[PDB]
Design an enzyme around this catalytic site. Structure first.
Site, PDB file in Angstrom:
ATOM      1  N   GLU A  20       0.878  -1.167   0.000  1.00 32.97           N
ATOM      2  CA  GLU A  20       0.000   0.000   0.000  1.00 32.97           C
ATOM      3  C   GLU A  20       0.932   1.238   0.000  1.00 32.97           C
ATOM      4  OE1 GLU A  20      -1.633  -1.558   3.657  1.00 32.97           O
ATOM      5  OE2 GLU A  20      -3.561  -1.895   2.786  1.00 32.97           O
ATOM      6  N   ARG A  45      -4.202  20.168  13.338  1.00 30.55           N
ATOM      7  CA  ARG A  45      -3.930  19.150  12.343  1.00 30.55           C
ATOM      8  C   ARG A  45      -5.015  18.056  12.485  1.00 30.55           C
ATOM      9  NH1 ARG A  45      -0.484  20.621   8.363  1.00 30.55           N
ATOM     10  NH2 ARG A  45       1.666  20.888   9.067  1.00 30.55           N
ATOM     11  N   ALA A  57       6.990  25.011   7.501  1.00 32.63           N
ATOM     12  CA  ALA A  57       7.096  23.845   6.618  1.00 32.63           C
ATOM     13  C   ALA A  57       5.956  23.906   5.622  1.00 32.63           C
ATOM     14  CB  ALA A  57       7.027  22.580   7.424  1.00 32.63           C
ATOM     15  N   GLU A  73       7.483  29.265   2.382  1.00 33.26           N
ATOM     16  CA  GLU A  73       6.769  28.857   3.607  1.00 33.26           C
ATOM     17  C   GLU A  73       7.246  29.735   4.783  1.00 33.26           C
ATOM     18  OE1 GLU A  73       4.306  25.818   2.089  1.00 33.26           O
ATOM     19  OE2 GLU A  73       4.296  27.174   3.800  1.00 33.26           O
ATOM     20  N   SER A  93       8.336   8.504   6.164  1.00 34.68           N
ATOM     21  CA  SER A  93       7.887   7.159   6.569  1.00 34.68           C
ATOM     22  C   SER A  93       7.931   6.273   5.352  1.00 34.68           C
ATOM     23  CB  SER A  93       6.477   7.221   7.163  1.00 34.68           C
ATOM     24  OG  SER A  93       6.173   5.941   7.711  1.00 34.68           O
ATOM     25  N   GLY A  95       8.167   3.253   4.741  1.00 33.61           N
ATOM     26  CA  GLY A  95       7.405   2.031   4.689  1.00 33.61           C
ATOM     27  C   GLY A  95       6.046   2.186   4.019  1.00 33.61           C
ATOM     28  N   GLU A  99       6.767  10.718   0.683  1.00 36.33           N
ATOM     29  CA  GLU A  99       7.013  12.109   1.079  1.00 36.33           C
ATOM     30  C   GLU A  99       8.472  12.257   1.527  1.00 36.33           C
ATOM     31  OE1 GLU A  99       4.619  13.727   4.238  1.00 36.33           O
ATOM     32  OE2 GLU A  99       5.575  15.747   4.018  1.00 36.33           O
ATOM     33  N   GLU A 116      -5.028  39.285  15.033  1.00 34.43           N
ATOM     34  CA  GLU A 116      -4.304  38.251  15.756  1.00 34.43           C
ATOM     35  C   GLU A 116      -4.693  36.875  15.212  1.00 34.43           C
ATOM     36  OE1 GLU A 116      -2.518  39.368  18.387  1.00 34.43           O
ATOM     37  OE2 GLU A 116      -3.709  40.941  19.451  1.00 34.43           O
TER      38      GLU A 116
END
Lengths: 157, 157
Positions: A20, A45, A57, A73, A93, A95, A99, A116
């Site tokens: 996957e 997030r 980032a 950024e 990652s 696995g 990215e 603000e």
């Protein structure tokens, strides 16, 4: 052979044999120190249900190289510009996703855009304090935030 | 509300409003130094088409806590056991996934399982050399590999 299950806005989901795979745009992150404080940012997030401590980032956009994306950024998230130096990269990652994050150091910061609005919250914090708060369970890190803290302790003291 | 597009073996893909979210099991990673060498591992990673420099790592399985998973991955990937100390955790890429990695230090290593099978290749390497090879473009890092290198330079010299 890669078979696509889903083609999306920053990711695709594919199967490659038994694997996957999430295809994802490459990213940048910017480490910046001023007066002993590191420039962290926080945002909600939805993937994790909280706002971890990160550094500025984001994703590399069409036409950009990593340096240009890092400039953008830093400016968009914090209103700052700096002299940027490429440090290193990592696969977040490998696995399951491709990215790749390109990390830069920013020096000689100047405010080019006034702040603000807390969509992105600017969090100047000594890295020692960030690490202590994390050890006490009071804040979470992203990979970029942790990399910034470790890089500081290794090379910027 | 989370709507599932795909329910898989280590990931799920969901939409939450406008957000694309990849649910993924939590992970562990183990930093280990011996005679100035760090214990890296390499494996082919189909998501990226290459074998980056990582440290022993893997997914937490049902019933395990992070410490137990760290013990298991050290043994399964390298045949070693050690005294493990929790260091810190990070979200690999909280803009799209909830994968959280728990990082441990291993000391007092002993070989408990004998190892020329290179499914997982054991790569003892001085961290300074890993960083130099990466700076020369000769090896890629995973987040776990980079975290190991930076942690060493910060705290283990």
């Amino acid at each position: 052979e890669r078979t696509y299950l889903y083609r999306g806005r920053i990711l695709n989901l594919a199967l490659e044999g038994r694997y996957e795979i999430v295809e994802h745009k490459p990213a940048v992150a910017v480490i910046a120190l001023r007066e002993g404080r590191m420039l962290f940012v926080r945002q909600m997030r939805p993937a994790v249900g909280l706002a971890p401590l990160e550094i500025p980032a984001g994703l590399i956009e069409p036409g950009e190289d990593p340096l240009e994306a890092a400039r953008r950024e830093l400016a968009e998230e914090t209103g700052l510009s700096g002299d940027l130096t490429y440090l290193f990269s990592y696969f977040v990652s490998p696995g399951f996703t491709d990215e790749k994050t390109h990390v830069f150091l920013a020096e000689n910061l100047k405010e080019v855009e006034a702040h603000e609005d807390e969509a992105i919250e600017v969090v100047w914090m000594r890295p020692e304090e960030a690490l202590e708060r994390h050890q006490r369970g009071e804040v979470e890190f992203s990979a970029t935030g942790l990399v910034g803290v470790l890089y500081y302790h290794a090379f910027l003291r």
